[PDB]
Design an enzyme around this catalytic site. Structure first.
Site, PDB file in Angstrom:
ATOM      1  N   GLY C   9       0.763  -1.223   0.000  1.00  0.00           N
ATOM      2  CA  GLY C   9       0.000   0.000   0.000  1.00  0.00           C
ATOM      3  C   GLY C   9       0.800   1.283   0.000  1.00  0.00           C
ATOM      4  N   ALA C  11       1.603   4.289   1.094  1.00  0.00           N
ATOM      5  CA  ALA C  11       2.541   4.643   2.146  1.00  0.00           C
ATOM      6  C   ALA C  11       3.642   3.617   2.237  1.00  0.00           C
ATOM      7  CB  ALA C  11       1.834   4.736   3.449  1.00  0.00           C
ATOM      8  N   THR C 140      -5.863  -0.195   1.882  1.00  0.00           N
ATOM      9  CA  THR C 140      -5.114  -1.397   1.571  1.00  0.00           C
ATOM     10  C   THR C 140      -3.971  -1.612   2.581  1.00  0.00           C
ATOM     11  OG1 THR C 140      -3.258  -1.121  -0.053  1.00  0.00           O
ATOM     12  CG2 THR C 140      -5.302  -0.316  -0.758  1.00  0.00           C
ATOM     13  N   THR C 174      -4.844  11.360   4.676  1.00  0.00           N
ATOM     14  CA  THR C 174      -5.788  11.119   3.580  1.00  0.00           C
ATOM     15  C   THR C 174      -7.230  11.158   4.069  1.00  0.00           C
ATOM     16  OG1 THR C 174      -4.185   9.600   2.549  1.00  0.00           O
ATOM     17  CG2 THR C 174      -6.288   9.701   1.565  1.00  0.00           C
ATOM     18  N   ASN C 223       9.730  10.627   3.890  1.00  0.00           N
ATOM     19  CA  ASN C 223      10.206   9.297   3.563  1.00  0.00           C
ATOM     20  C   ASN C 223      11.721   9.157   3.694  1.00  0.00           C
ATOM     21  OD1 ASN C 223       7.615   8.444   3.084  1.00  0.00           O
ATOM     22  ND2 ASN C 223       7.762   8.559   0.853  1.00  0.00           N
ATOM     23  N   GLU C 249      17.074 -13.184  17.966  1.00  0.00           N
ATOM     24  CA  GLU C 249      18.079 -12.520  18.780  1.00  0.00           C
ATOM     25  C   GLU C 249      17.874 -11.015  18.930  1.00  0.00           C
ATOM     26  OE1 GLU C 249      22.605 -13.632  18.394  1.00  0.00           O
ATOM     27  OE2 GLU C 249      21.784 -12.319  19.972  1.00  0.00           O
TER      28      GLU C 249
HETATM   29  N1  LIG Z   1       4.948   8.617   6.010  1.00  0.00           N
HETATM   30  C1  LIG Z   1       4.209   8.499   4.915  1.00  0.00           C
HETATM   31  N2  LIG Z   1       2.853   8.349   5.072  1.00  0.00           N
HETATM   32  C2  LIG Z   1       2.047   8.230   3.988  1.00  0.00           C
HETATM   33  C3  LIG Z   1       2.573   8.243   2.701  1.00  0.00           C
HETATM   34  N3  LIG Z   1       1.529   8.096   1.846  1.00  0.00           N
HETATM   35  C4  LIG Z   1       0.370   7.989   2.558  1.00  0.00           C
HETATM   36  N4  LIG Z   1       0.690   8.084   3.889  1.00  0.00           N
HETATM   37  C5  LIG Z   1      -0.172   7.997   5.066  1.00  0.00           C
HETATM   38  O1  LIG Z   1      -0.802   6.740   5.047  1.00  0.00           O
HETATM   39  C6  LIG Z   1      -2.139   6.855   5.450  1.00  0.00           C
HETATM   40  C7  LIG Z   1      -2.996   6.475   4.257  1.00  0.00           C
HETATM   41  O2  LIG Z   1      -2.490   5.250   3.789  1.00  0.00           O
HETATM   42  P1  LIG Z   1      -2.407   4.997   2.219  1.00  0.00           P
HETATM   43  O3  LIG Z   1      -1.142   4.233   1.809  1.00  0.00           O
HETATM   44  O4  LIG Z   1      -2.518   6.331   1.562  1.00  0.00           O
HETATM   45  O5  LIG Z   1      -3.703   4.090   1.946  1.00  0.00           O
HETATM   46  P2  LIG Z   1      -3.619   2.704   1.162  1.00  0.00           P
HETATM   47  O6  LIG Z   1      -5.021   2.090   1.092  1.00  0.00           O
HETATM   48  O7  LIG Z   1      -2.666   1.889   1.901  1.00  0.00           O
HETATM   49  O8  LIG Z   1      -3.064   3.028  -0.309  1.00  0.00           O
HETATM   50  P3  LIG Z   1      -4.122   3.362  -1.469  1.00  0.00           P
HETATM   51  O9  LIG Z   1      -4.361   2.137  -2.358  1.00  0.00           O
HETATM   52  O10 LIG Z   1      -3.538   4.462  -2.275  1.00  0.00           O
HETATM   53  O11 LIG Z   1      -5.484   3.830  -0.890  1.00  0.00           O
HETATM   54  C8  LIG Z   1      -2.323   8.291   5.899  1.00  0.00           C
HETATM   55  O12 LIG Z   1      -2.063   8.285   7.281  1.00  0.00           O
HETATM   56  C9  LIG Z   1      -1.247   9.050   5.157  1.00  0.00           C
HETATM   57  O13 LIG Z   1      -0.752  10.164   5.856  1.00  0.00           O
HETATM   58  C10 LIG Z   1       3.949   8.395   2.536  1.00  0.00           C
HETATM   59  O14 LIG Z   1       4.440   8.414   1.417  1.00  0.00           O
HETATM   60  N5  LIG Z   1       4.763   8.526   3.644  1.00  0.00           N
HETATM   61  C1  LIG Z   2     -13.889  15.021   4.596  1.00  0.00           C
HETATM   62  O1  LIG Z   2     -12.488  14.867   4.366  1.00  0.00           O
HETATM   63  C2  LIG Z   2     -12.383  14.217   3.197  1.00  0.00           C
HETATM   64  C3  LIG Z   2     -13.276  14.470   2.160  1.00  0.00           C
HETATM   65  C4  LIG Z   2     -13.149  13.777   0.960  1.00  0.00           C
HETATM   66  C5  LIG Z   2     -12.121  12.852   0.784  1.00  0.00           C
HETATM   67  N1  LIG Z   2     -12.068  12.184  -0.378  1.00  0.00           N
HETATM   68  S1  LIG Z   2     -11.251  12.522  -1.750  1.00  0.00           S
HETATM   69  O2  LIG Z   2      -9.936  11.795  -1.708  1.00  0.00           O
HETATM   70  O3  LIG Z   2     -12.083  12.079  -2.920  1.00  0.00           O
HETATM   71  C6  LIG Z   2     -10.909  14.177  -1.884  1.00  0.00           C
HETATM   72  C7  LIG Z   2      -9.789  14.641  -1.236  1.00  0.00           C
HETATM   73  F1  LIG Z   2      -9.021  13.797  -0.525  1.00  0.00           F
HETATM   74  C8  LIG Z   2      -9.477  15.977  -1.317  1.00  0.00           C
HETATM   75  F2  LIG Z   2      -8.380  16.397  -0.668  1.00  0.00           F
HETATM   76  C9  LIG Z   2     -10.285  16.848  -2.058  1.00  0.00           C
HETATM   77  F3  LIG Z   2      -9.984  18.158  -2.137  1.00  0.00           F
HETATM   78  C10 LIG Z   2     -11.422  16.389  -2.727  1.00  0.00           C
HETATM   79  F4  LIG Z   2     -12.192  17.261  -3.449  1.00  0.00           F
HETATM   80  C11 LIG Z   2     -11.726  15.021  -2.632  1.00  0.00           C
HETATM   81  F5  LIG Z   2     -12.806  14.495  -3.253  1.00  0.00           F
HETATM   82  C12 LIG Z   2     -11.232  12.593   1.847  1.00  0.00           C
HETATM   83  C13 LIG Z   2     -11.373  13.290   3.056  1.00  0.00           C
HETATM   84  F6  LIG Z   2     -10.557  13.112   4.108  1.00  0.00           F
HETATM   85 MG   LIG Z   3      -6.580   2.519   0.113  1.00  0.00          MG
HETATM   86 MG   LIG Z   4      26.045 -15.309  19.317  1.00  0.00          MG
END
Ligand SMILES: Nc1nc2c(ncn2[C@@H]2O[C@H](COP(=O)(O)OP(=O)(O)OP(=O)(O)O)[C@@H](O)[C@H]2O)c(=O)[nH]1
Ligand SMILES: COc1ccc(NS(=O)(=O)c2c(F)c(F)c(F)c(F)c2F)cc1F
Ligand SMILES: [Mg+2]
Ligand SMILES: [Mg+2]
Ligand SMILES: Nc1nc2c(ncn2[C@@H]2O[C@H](COP(=O)(O)OP(=O)(O)OP(=O)(O)O)[C@@H](O)[C@H]2O)c(=O)[nH]1
Ligand SMILES: Nc1nc2c(ncn2[C@@H]2O[C@H](COP(=O)(O)OP(=O)(O)O)[C@@H](O)[C@H]2O)c(=O)[nH]1
Ligand SMILES: Nc1nc2c(ncn2[C@@H]2O[C@H](COP(=O)(O)OP(=O)(O)O)[C@@H](O)[C@H]2O)c(=O)[nH]1
Ligand SMILES: COc1ccc(NS(=O)(=O)c2c(F)c(F)c(F)c(F)c2F)cc1F
Ligand SMILES: [Mg+2]
Lengths: 124, 427, 428, 420, 427
Positions: C9, C11, C140, C174, C223, C249
């Site tokens: 996933g 991150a 994920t 996110t 990262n 260990e």
């Molecule tokens: N440290 C770090 N955190 C990340 C990164 N990308 C996403 N995150 C964090 O991971 C969380 C979201 O996880 P995601 O990897 O975006 O979700 P996912 O379902 O695993 O991946 P997707 O298939 O894209 O939805 C949130 O807390 C984000 O701040 C990254 O590149 N570095």
């Molecule tokens: C209410 O806070 C959210 C609202 C919508 C979403 N969903 S999103 O991925 O489709 C989305 C965004 F993350 C975002 F930053 C946007 F500006 C947006 F318009 C949007 F749909 C994710 C959120 F955390």
């Molecule tokens: Mg996801």
């Molecule tokens: Mg040893």
């Protein structure tokens, strides 16, 4: 002192003789027992066939650790296997039944335009 | 990851045609041909809205539905008509009637299939179909009536994928029909069951933004559609742009709607307007936030004062110090801290995109799931109950095959939706 | 012996993408896969396999249910590094919810992944375990990761599993439902891991701001920093040297109890391009500002401490440093376990990404400490959770992909439990 | 009259490899070949430690055991690696884990046989097998764990012959693992049942002799092993030298250990590092100079063997030794008469014109165990890191059992500060 | 008539080894066995060239008997008469008597019998052995019981080496001593104790040897023994037979142990100093410094005295000497027995090992006295014993080779008894 010396035997390469000096002045190991010798052999052969059946003791449990380890592992794998299949075809059976639950209100508010369009067969 | 578009009914189409021509310009597309523009990003996500065909060419994923030739030959003989696939047009011949029954039962389900036949083609030839979004009027018949039918026929075929509508809630001022209440209420019931998000575009609001703030005397269906088109562009941005990262529109749903019923968003726009009136660009970010959040600047006629915000999405536009966006956005949730619900944490997410819309150096747009929306429905259900009173114009539906109590049923249902938006000013 | 990385996933992927980067710099492997140094005509062999007669391939697997992120890997140099195989992608998203990731969209791809992984195990004469990189929130990252770990647990008996999770932070986030996802996975995820390295995204973001000067730090900004911490941890057993040299260990030192996995990391000198004493860096390790999970450990107690030095160090100073860490601070060791400090030195000086934000350092430290203090983040999370579920706030989206109302009940039930366990380790 | 050598586990082997290279130098042996040295005595008792093979050649009677290649290829690629028979090495592949359970049960008894198979091959081709001695770490798993397993499997095959160990007893300072207590305590129990003498080499002690008296700042596992290797040489002298007359190693046992349990010796060395007789006695008897971390003040001496080294007026040894049992008369138990025997041998060790070494059965040792059982009970407290053993197939109360047993050995060393 | 020597266990062997040496010098027999009845008492004229001692040597480790069959003398004994036994006795009676003894006893006992077989009137046995030490105490005991069975009348004379703290092997020595001397006791007839400490003392004052060897001590003991056996190898009144030995010395079956005091022990290099008078040597015999068992006899009483002169002596000085030993001394004779002095002269001048430490003397004396004083060593031993057993100190090693806790009780019991008997002879 001044002695008196009684002469007991003269010889070739020698000669003895007492000298009494002053008057004197008063007036079956058996066999059987190496019966003992083998009761030691017996008390050894016990005391030692003991700190030996004491080590067969220490053994059998060795097996049982190695064995109750792996034994309690087929516990984990062969339980986490069907803590999935019966929580993931519990789950699949869940949404699968819920999808129909939806397709249902929708088969019905459907056979409903059918029911009130066969209602449009009356307008005079 | 790739989405179809249905665009039905006079209003539905007049909006869509503008929406399309606006975005087609963001990505840069000829009336027919393809890309021409010094930018590069554009076509990253051109996928999402444009099923592309032979030669170069970029044909949009669009079905146009209507119940009479009328406003189809409008688009084809006008702005960007050379673009839509010649047979993604489903005609009507008959009337719309401006009557929901007609649209949803008789004259509509008459057609229905030939639309589904075409949606099934575009969808069946998707790579991974996100879902459908639809535009349409809520009062007046072919738009709302056949529309709500279509979505009901789209679910069932695709329960699976998600349902999105731009639905123009109609109003006393700037309306053609005494019956709008009926038409609106009947669809409002339909929508609460069958979509996943609806953008509540209030025609009332729209007009208010034109007189109350715009010095625009006698507003066309035009300089009004211009607002929605702008609003739509800014609302969709994240579906069709960055790499930061994506917006599933399913993601949009899961994040915006806490409760399955309450998918009613008030949109809002940053800067507004037209021709020799746009001279500003003195739009600033501070001045941009206060404005995108002002009641005077919603796309739904309801002040988000009475009623708190459930969740909010806000999305800026144009190369600007987003370091400042963060802390301005934070200031909005402080100088107004009370009016964002306490029980959904970090419940407003903001994003920036650095490619400006038509004109405008800076912009922004706002999506809000607000219980202030409560007011909208009340105000339609108030002129509705007012008619269903001594069963007013009803006989037009009665005898189109519709039931007496099917109105009470839609009245009941919607009056509940008011009750729940109200349930959620809690603790 | 061997050592397979999994990045599940977004991150997870990007993190990995940025330590695999670092590993390659640290061993002089060009993206070309080929390295003109040492042999392979072991050391570097724990993480890499000398496939063909020129190349180097990471013992890795990347998974994501949206192509987007894995795709980027097979675009930018490094494209050449992995095998076309080892990067799996899944057509449709997880859409920010565990339920989707664990059951609905997971289910499908899990069978392929699990096998491909197995193909790597297949060329490992004594495979040792798995390093799993994933987000805490996010669909994920929480969801599939869970499914994987259960399955991994089944397919791989002894084999330890080490997880590196990204505990989520309000700002660089996110999803709104993040809390649900986290508490959900961490519950399932829990009795399948052995030791788990939490990275509080907030703290990372904080280190970058105070210590790097970055006004608003990128994902790839963060990262790079995490790459470093991870590389410091994996370090030990990528060269072999002095202390911490096999997987049992290493960790047998950190967890005392089959629960309590989560140690707290504290990377030493983070200082910006454009030296510090062995004592200073040692001391920087006990500063909550230089910490790696937003919390307060002069508060909770210590139940095991570890100091992982990297660079130019005679232990003579390392000792003399520890001395005055105890003379001048909150000692804080819990009732029933030594006053530890397992000290490992790996002489290899720390390399840093060349056009990066951190400067080349002479010596850096790491300090892994299993402190009860880390429970602060366990609550900070649950209170978010508790006060949404208090209203079923988004539950209906999970029951949608066919989950049970009771599972939330059940999964929270466990954090109550854990939060108890943790506090239930203080004093006698 | 001829003895085999087991040398198991990282420490066990790092020590053994040094011991061997040290003695191989006393007798004079090439990396491979045989004798080269103007002395003659040497090969009188070379029999005892060297089963000799084809050509000239002198291969040592050594089994090397470990649970991973690692520290075997260390010895083979280093000092005197060309010497040990190519297949007296038993590999491991798997882990040791640094975990006693692993060593004594699972990953160890996995191997075990292939070790016994080899020991049985060296022993069965002895003329008159004295017995076995084993070197090994006490904390850390392959050394202690498999070791204690080995000895248990060696008694039973050969109750008969006597059991000897150099067992290094681990400490807080200079240690790699939080679990050392457990690993030590588990084996300490084992040892008290299965050996006849154990040399208590305290790793704590060792280090102390490097900072407190050495000016040696940052001590390797190296200049520390050097101490043990030196200590081992001098301790063994009586088995592999004179004709004055012999030391049966059985004889050693019968004479040093009054009570079956209490076979725990603190060794001590004379000069150290990297000398007069008076100055040599005071030094080999100083607490500051034991091989176990315990001052033989708290606790008297049961029996003591002390063995000098180098052509020197032994007329003076007699009367210096007698002086130690006078200016300290109180600290040698009254109820064992003439209970300290001293011997001289006139062929010096590596370097060093003069030397000496001391074996003591002292109840000061009491302190060592206490101090391990004190950081042990501290852990077993709220059952600490135990789950690593728990779930390797081991029992909750098998710890309490080893804890109990050892805490008794403390009790008896204490019982013996008695009366007459 | 005949006379078989047994040497059991290291000490015993080397002692023998160094008197057989002396006997050979005394009779001009080269190591090759050949010389160019009288002394037939100890040697058998086997073959028609050779001389073979009527001896048997036994030890459970080969080491020591091995050395005999290396160094000239190798030719002297019969390959047969030297038995060795593969594994040690390991410094404890229990092992010697029962565990490792048992095995070899049957062979030894028989080989001995092979010597009896060629003896037309065999007289008895001279057994040489250590007091402490495993095979000396242990096996010797087993032997003696058995010898007592297979050989009815035949007297047994034992020469034991009473151990001394300095030149010592073992810590358990006391245990082994008290252990044997108990079993060993009612099977012997007369027993010659040799206190190793005294011997070591004579060597230091009288010989100048800074730290005297084993073979240093042995040479001296060789001498004392050769003085005692003397009478029955040259035949010359006073102890011409083993019967006479008990007759003359031991008046109570229990009280075996006479006290020997060898006359002029003076170092070569002194060898040319004017020789000592018949009176001086006689007098030297009453000096506890010139004694053979560390004790004090002008303290205890005398119950039988014997003066064995060797060399150039008319009795008319021997008399005149005795005169003034009384006139000027602690007479000390016990209540109910003459004031003895049975005097034997054997004219044969004393020879001494040529590269040895003592010089060739003109005349030497021997004095065997059975004095209650010797009980001092009996206590000096028991107090060592008592104070180990007081704590079971090493007992567990014996119970190991399958002995009885109760045997120690029982054997000490007897020494309490003896120590009583002994003191219970005064006044
Ligand atoms: N440290 C770090 N955190 C990340 C990164 N990308 C996403 N995150 C964090 O991971 C969380 C979201 O996880 P995601 O990897 O975006 O979700 P996912 O379902 O695993 O991946 P997707 O298939 O894209 O939805 C949130 O807390 C984000 O701040 C990254 O590149 N570095
Ligand atoms: C209410 O806070 C959210 C609202 C919508 C979403 N969903 S999103 O991925 O489709 C989305 C965004 F993350 C975002 F930053 C946007 F500006 C947006 F318009 C949007 F749909 C994710 C959120 F955390
Ligand atoms: Mg996801
Ligand atoms: Mg040893
Ligand atoms: N006088 C004298 N005493 C000796 C001699 N050798 C040993 N001893 C003493 O004998 C006692 C030990 O007896 P050993 O003969 O050594 O023991 P053993 O069991 O008979 O012989 P081993 O089989 O070698 O054990 C001690 O008191 C020693 O001091 C010797 O050659 N001369
Ligand atoms: N903003 C917008 N609203 C419109 C437009 N045309 C009609 N409407 C509104 O929608 C309602 C009538 O919809 P209409 O499309 O004419 O009905 P239909 O063609 O039969 O579906 C009225 O309330 C109008 O206010 C349009 O041009 N733009
Ligand atoms: N003196 C000595 N002690 C050592 C050495 N190596 C390890 N030790 C000690 O023994 C313990 C660990 O033993 P180790 O051999 O690593 O365990 P194993 O290889 O799995 O049997 C620790 O307490 C160390 O202090 C060595 O080189 N010499
Ligand atoms: C307690 O003093 C003794 C210790 C050991 C022994 N027995 S021994 O044969 O093993 C032995 C010695 F006699 C000796 F003098 C030593 F120096 C020695 F190392 C030894 F083992 C005899 C002792 F009186
Ligand atoms: Mg013996």
């Amino acid at each position: 002192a001044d002695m008196e010396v009684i002469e007991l035997n003269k010889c070739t390469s020698g000669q003895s003789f007492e000298v009494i000096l002053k008057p004197p002045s008063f007036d079956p190991s058996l066999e059987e027992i190496q019966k003992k010798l083998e009761a030691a052999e017996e008390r050894r052969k016990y005391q030692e066939a003991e700190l030996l059946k004491h080590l067969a003791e220490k053994r059998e449990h060795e097996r049982e650790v190695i064995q109750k380890a792996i034994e309690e592992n087929n516990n984990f794998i062969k339980m986490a296997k069907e803590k999935l299949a019966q929580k993931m075809e519990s789950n699949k059976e869940n949404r699968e039944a819920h999808l129909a639950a939806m397709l249902e209100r929708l088969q019905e508010k459907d056979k409903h335009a059918e029911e009130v369009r066969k209602n449009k067969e009356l307008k005079e | 990851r790739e989405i179809v578009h249905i665009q039905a009914g006079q209003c539905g189409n007049q909006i869509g045609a503008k929406f399309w021509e606006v975005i087609s310009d963001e990505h840069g597309i000829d009336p027919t041909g393809s890309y021409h523009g010094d930018s590069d990003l554009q076509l990253e996500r051109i996928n999402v809205y444009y099923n592309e065909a032979t030669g170069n060419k970029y044909v949009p994923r669009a079905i146009l539905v209507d119940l009479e030739p009328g406003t189809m030959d409008s688009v084809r003989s006008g702005p960007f008509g050379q673009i839509f696939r010649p047979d993604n047009f489903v005609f009507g011949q008959s009337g719309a009637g401006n009557n929901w029954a007609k649209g949803h039962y008789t004259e509509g389900a008459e057609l229905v299939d030939s639309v589904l036949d075409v949606v099934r083609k575009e969808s069946e030839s998707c790579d991974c179909l996100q879902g459908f979004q639809l535009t349409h009027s809520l009062g007046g018949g072919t738009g709302s009536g056949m529309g709500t039918l279509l979505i009901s026929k789209i679910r069932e075929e695709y329960p699976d994928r998600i349902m999105n509508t731009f639905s123009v809630m109609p109003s006393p001022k700037v309306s053609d029909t005494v019956v709008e209440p009926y038409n609106a209420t009947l669809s409002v019931h339909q929508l609460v069951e069958n979509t996943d998000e609806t953008y509540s575009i209030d025609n009332e609001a729209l007009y208010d933004i034109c007189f109350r703030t715009l010095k625009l005397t006698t507003p066309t269906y035009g300089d009004l559609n211009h607002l929605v088109s702008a609003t739509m562009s800014g609302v969709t941005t994240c579906l069709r742009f960055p790499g930061q990262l994506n917006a599933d529109l399913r993601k949009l749903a899961v994040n915006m709607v806490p409760f399955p019923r309450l998918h009613f968003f008030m949109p809002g726009f940053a800067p507004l307007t037209s021709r020799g009136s746009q001279q500003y660009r003195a739009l600033t970010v501070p001045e941009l936030t206060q404005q995108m959040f002002d009641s005077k600047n919603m796309m739904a006629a309801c002040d988000p004062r009475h009623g708190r915000y459930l969740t909010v999405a806000a999305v800026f536009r144009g190369r600007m110090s987003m370091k400042e966006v963060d802390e301005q956005m934070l200031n909005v949730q402080n100088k107004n801290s009370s009016y964002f619900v306490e029980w959904i944490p970090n419940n407003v997410k903001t994003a920036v995109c650095d490619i400006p819309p038509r004109g405008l150096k800076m912009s922004a747009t706002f999506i809000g799931n607000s219980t202030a929306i409560q007011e909208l429905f009340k105000r339609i259900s108030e002129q509705f109950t007012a008619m269903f009173r001594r069963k007013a114009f009803l006989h037009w539906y009665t005898g189109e095959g519709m039931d007496e109590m099917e109105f009470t049923e839609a009245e009941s249902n919607m009056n509940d939706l008011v009750s729940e938006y109200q349930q959620y000013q809690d603790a | 012996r061997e050592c397979i990385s999994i990045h599940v996933g977004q991150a997870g992927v990007q993190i990995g993408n940025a330590c695999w980067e670092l590993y390659c710099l640290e061993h002089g492997i060009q993206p070309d896969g080929q390295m003109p140094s040492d042999k392979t005509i072991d050391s570097f062999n724990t993480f890499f396999s000398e496939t063909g007669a020129g190349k180097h391939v990471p013992r890795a697997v990347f998974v994501d249910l949206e192509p987007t992120v894995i795709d980027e890997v097979r675009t930018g140099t490094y494209r050449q590094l992995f095998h076309p195989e080892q990067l799996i992608t899944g057509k449709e998203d997880a859409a920010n919810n565990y339920a989707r990731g664990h059951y609905t969209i997971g289910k499908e791809i899990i069978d392929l992944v699990l096998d491909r992984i197995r193909k790597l195990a297949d060329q490992c004469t004594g495979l040792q375990g798995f390093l799993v990189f994933h987000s805490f929130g996010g669909g994920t990252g929480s969801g599939f990761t869970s499914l994987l770990m259960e399955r991994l647990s089944v397919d791989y008996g002894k084999k330890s599993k080490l997880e590196f999770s990204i505990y989520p932070a309000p700002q660089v986030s996110t999803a709104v439902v993040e809390p649900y996802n986290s508490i959900l996975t961490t519950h399932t995820t829990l009795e399948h891991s052995d030791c788990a390295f939490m990275v509080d995204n907030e703290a990372i973001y904080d280190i970058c701001r105070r210590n790097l000067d970055i006004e608003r730090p990128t994902y790839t900004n963060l990262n790079r920093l995490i790459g470093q911490i991870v590389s410091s941890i994996t370090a030990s057993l990528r060269f072999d040297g002095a202390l911490n040299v096999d997987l049992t260990e290493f960790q047998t030192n950190l967890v005392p109890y089959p629960r309590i996995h989560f140690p707290l990391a504290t990377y030493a000198p983070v200082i910006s391009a454009e030296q510090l004493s062995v004592a200073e860096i040692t001391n920087a390790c006990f500063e909550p500002a230089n910490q790696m999970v937003k919390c307060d450990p002069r508060h909770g107690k210590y139940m095991a401490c570890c100091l992982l030095y990297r660079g130019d160090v005679v232990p003579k100073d390392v000792n003399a440093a520890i001395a005055t860490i105890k003379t001048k601070r909150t000692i804080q060791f819990v009732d029933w376990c030594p006053t530890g400090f397992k000290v490992g030195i790996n002489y290899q000086p720390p390399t840093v990404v060349p056009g990066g934000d951190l400067a080349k350092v002479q010596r850096a430290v790491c300090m892994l400490s299993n402190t009860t203090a880390i429970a602060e983040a366990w609550a900070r999370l649950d209170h978010k959770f508790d006060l949404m579920y208090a209203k079923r706030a988004f539950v209906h989206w999970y029951v949608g992909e066919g989950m049970e109302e009771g599972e939330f009940s059940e999964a929270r039930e466990d954090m109550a439990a854990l939060e108890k366990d943790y506090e239930e380790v203080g004093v006698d």
